[PDB]
Known about the structure:
Layout: H1 14-22, H2 30-49, H3 57-62, H4 78-85, E1 90-93, E2 111-116, E3 119-126, E4 129-134, E5 141-143, H5 145-158, E6 161-166, H6 173-176
Antiparallel strand pairs: 1-6, 2-3, 2-6, 3-4, 4-5
Helix pairs in contact: 2-4
EC number: 3.4.19.12
Catalytic activity: Thiol-dependent hydrolysis of ester, thioester, amide, peptide and isopeptide bonds formed by the C-terminal Gly of ubiquitin (a 76-residue protein attached to proteins as an intracellular targeting signal)
Membrane topology: Peripheral membrane protein
Amino acid sequence: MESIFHEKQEGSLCAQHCLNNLLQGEYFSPVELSSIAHQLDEEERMRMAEGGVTSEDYRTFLQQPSGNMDDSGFFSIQVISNALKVWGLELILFNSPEYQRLRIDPINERSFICNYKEHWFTVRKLGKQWFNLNSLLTGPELISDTYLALFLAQLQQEGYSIFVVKGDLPDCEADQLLQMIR
């Protein structure tokens, strides 16, 4: 419980708190989140350029806030999906036809965040256990191995879009020193 690096958010910057927690630490900032948000625009842009552009359609798409943030609060999941992808991570949905009932041990993962409509909740593994880190979370909220399977199940039954970050994360000392809990 000693070295839990949780970036305590005060404000609306949910992309910031979500990612600065998700990556096991502070790696992104508001403007930078808008910069990565822009990479969706240009990535989908190139994606369309790979096949699916008449002529004006290209511009008719670019005249859009494609991931581009204005309200620094209701960031859409794409910002965590891409921000990890640019770091060498993958992001799966936990409500996918298969992924929802394929039996992925949440406790086995390294990190996954959930989004209720527009609101983020960060779930990161530290040590042998997992911690909830929310926008207005006073910090780390403990979640036992089994209570994790409980957390996730409640999410899908409550209306949470959960997202399982897959890959190698920037491991912080928190994971090493979470062998001590309460």
